[PDB]
Structures are given as structure tokens and as C-alpha cells.
Scaffold this active site. Sequence first.
Site, PDB file in Angstrom:
ATOM      1  N   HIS A  12       0.571  -1.260  -0.067  1.00  0.00           N
ATOM      2  CA  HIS A  12       0.103  -0.277  -0.059  1.00  0.00           C
ATOM      3  C   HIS A  12       0.736   1.147  -0.030  1.00  0.00           C
ATOM      4  O   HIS A  12       0.374   2.419  -0.476  1.00  0.00           O
ATOM      5  CB  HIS A  12      -1.021   0.013   1.223  1.00  0.00           C
ATOM      6  CG  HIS A  12      -1.754  -1.218   1.181  1.00  0.00           C
ATOM      7  ND1 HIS A  12      -2.800  -1.193   0.322  1.00  0.00           N
ATOM      8  CD2 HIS A  12      -1.792  -2.267   1.755  1.00  0.00           C
ATOM      9  CE1 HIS A  12      -3.695  -2.494   0.682  1.00  0.00           C
ATOM     10  NE2 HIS A  12      -2.882  -2.995   1.569  1.00  0.00           N
ATOM     11  N   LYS A  41      -4.306  -9.952  -7.818  1.00  0.00           N
ATOM     12  CA  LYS A  41      -5.202  -9.194  -6.880  1.00  0.00           C
ATOM     13  C   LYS A  41      -6.226  -8.492  -7.548  1.00  0.00           C
ATOM     14  O   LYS A  41      -5.924  -7.730  -8.354  1.00  0.00           O
ATOM     15  CB  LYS A  41      -4.381  -8.295  -5.896  1.00  0.00           C
ATOM     16  CG  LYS A  41      -3.562  -9.048  -5.046  1.00  0.00           C
ATOM     17  CD  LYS A  41      -3.075  -8.006  -4.091  1.00  0.00           C
ATOM     18  CE  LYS A  41      -1.840  -8.594  -3.361  1.00  0.00           C
ATOM     19  NZ  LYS A  41      -2.031  -9.781  -2.721  1.00  0.00           N
ATOM     20  N   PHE A 120      -5.456  -2.866   5.013  1.00  0.00           N
ATOM     21  CA  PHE A 120      -6.175  -1.956   4.536  1.00  0.00           C
ATOM     22  C   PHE A 120      -7.624  -2.279   4.603  1.00  0.00           C
ATOM     23  O   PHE A 120      -7.873  -3.167   3.963  1.00  0.00           O
ATOM     24  CB  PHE A 120      -5.585  -1.448   3.320  1.00  0.00           C
ATOM     25  CG  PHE A 120      -6.016  -0.016   2.664  1.00  0.00           C
ATOM     26  CD1 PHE A 120      -7.271  -0.098   1.791  1.00  0.00           C
ATOM     27  CD2 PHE A 120      -5.443   1.209   2.591  1.00  0.00           C
ATOM     28  CE1 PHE A 120      -7.917   1.132   1.346  1.00  0.00           C
ATOM     29  CE2 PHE A 120      -5.849   2.389   2.168  1.00  0.00           C
ATOM     30  CZ  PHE A 120      -7.032   2.218   1.443  1.00  0.00           C
ATOM     31  N   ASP A 121      -8.609  -1.714   5.097  1.00  0.00           N
ATOM     32  CA  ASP A 121      -9.887  -2.129   5.208  1.00  0.00           C
ATOM     33  C   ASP A 121     -10.884  -1.553   4.315  1.00  0.00           C
ATOM     34  O   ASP A 121     -11.369  -2.276   3.571  1.00  0.00           O
ATOM     35  CB  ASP A 121     -10.680  -2.023   6.783  1.00  0.00           C
ATOM     36  CG  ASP A 121     -11.625  -3.053   7.176  1.00  0.00           C
ATOM     37  OD1 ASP A 121     -11.283  -4.041   6.949  1.00  0.00           O
ATOM     38  OD2 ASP A 121     -12.515  -2.538   7.613  1.00  0.00           O
TER      39      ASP A 121
HETATM   40  C1  LIG Z   1       0.332 -10.857   0.091  1.00  0.00           C
HETATM   41  C2  LIG Z   1      -0.489 -10.061  -0.881  1.00  0.00           C
HETATM   42  C3  LIG Z   1      -1.505 -10.802  -1.700  1.00  0.00           C
HETATM   43  C4  LIG Z   1      -1.954 -11.974  -1.386  1.00  0.00           C
HETATM   44  N1  LIG Z   1      -2.988 -12.612  -2.055  1.00  0.00           N
HETATM   45  O1  LIG Z   1      -3.162 -13.805  -1.449  1.00  0.00           O
HETATM   46  O2  LIG Z   1      -3.527 -12.130  -2.934  1.00  0.00           O
HETATM   47  C5  LIG Z   1      -1.353 -12.655  -0.384  1.00  0.00           C
HETATM   48  C6  LIG Z   1      -0.230 -12.115   0.473  1.00  0.00           C
HETATM   49  N2  LIG Z   1       0.483 -12.854   1.386  1.00  0.00           N
HETATM   50  O3  LIG Z   1       1.173 -12.188   2.490  1.00  0.00           O
HETATM   51  O4  LIG Z   1      -0.156 -13.886   1.796  1.00  0.00           O
END
Ligand SMILES: *c1cc(*)c([N+](=O)[O-])cc1[N+](=O)[O-]
Length: 124
Positions: A12, A41, A120-121
Site C-alpha cells: 500500500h 489481486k 487496509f480495510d
Molecule cells: C500478500 C499479498 C496478496 C496475497 N494474496 O493472496 O492475494 C497474499 C499475500 N500474503 O502475504 O499472503
Amino acid sequence: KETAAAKFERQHMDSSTSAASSSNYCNQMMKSRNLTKDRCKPVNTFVHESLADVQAVCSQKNVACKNGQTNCYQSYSTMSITDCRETGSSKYPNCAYKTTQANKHIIVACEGNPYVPVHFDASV
Ligand SMILES: *c1cc(*)c([N+](=O)[O-])cc1[N+](=O)[O-]
């Protein structure tokens, strides 16, 4: 190995700019912070404020977190943020993002001693 605090900064924080530079900002950032190694993501937010102003959120307005816990805090002021959302053309490993500039209040969950942001909510 990577603490929840450190992951918050990687995912972030972007103190290097006041706002997203180009339509390619999210594409570059998602990739350079290694946020798309496991999957694309669907959404991500970057905050363009100093680390100290973001950490200070943990002593600001206490609000309920989405999960119903009470360790969430909303920034007193709005902050410069960048919204990254997957486009219709994204398929892992070739994730793709739409970059949008915004100014909104941030809500983060805090934890530990020192008490810092870990998740981050939402943005409001
Ligand atoms: C960090 C960032 C994204 C994810 N994800 O599963 O989309 C997972 C992690 N993490 O540290 O597990």
C-alpha cells in the site's frame, strides 16, 4: 519472515509521488512490489502520503472493521490514494490494471507495539 507491518508498506505505501503519474502506474507498481506473483489481486490501493502520516492513523478516529473487530481507524483527513482494479483483459500471469486517482479517508486495522497499520480495510 515478512511481518504484517512490512507487508502493509509493500502493498500500500507509495510516498515517492503525490499521485499516480500515468495510466500505467498500477501495472508498474503491482509488478515491482511483487503483488502479482501468486495471482492477480482484483483490487489494490496505494497511499501517497508519508509513512509517519499513515502510521498516525492508528491514533485517529476509531471505527468498526468490516470483520466486526474494533482495532480499525479512519484518517481524520482525506489522503491522496491510487485505486488499481483489474481490467477485463487480465489473466494471470498477465495481470492488468486500470489506474484511478482519488482523495479519500483511509480505514486501516492496527496491531502490535509499536501500534501500526497491518491491513487496509476500506477507503471512504
Ligand atoms: C500478500 C499479498 C496478496 C496475497 N494474496 O493472496 O492475494 C497474499 C499475500 N500474503 O502475504 O499472503
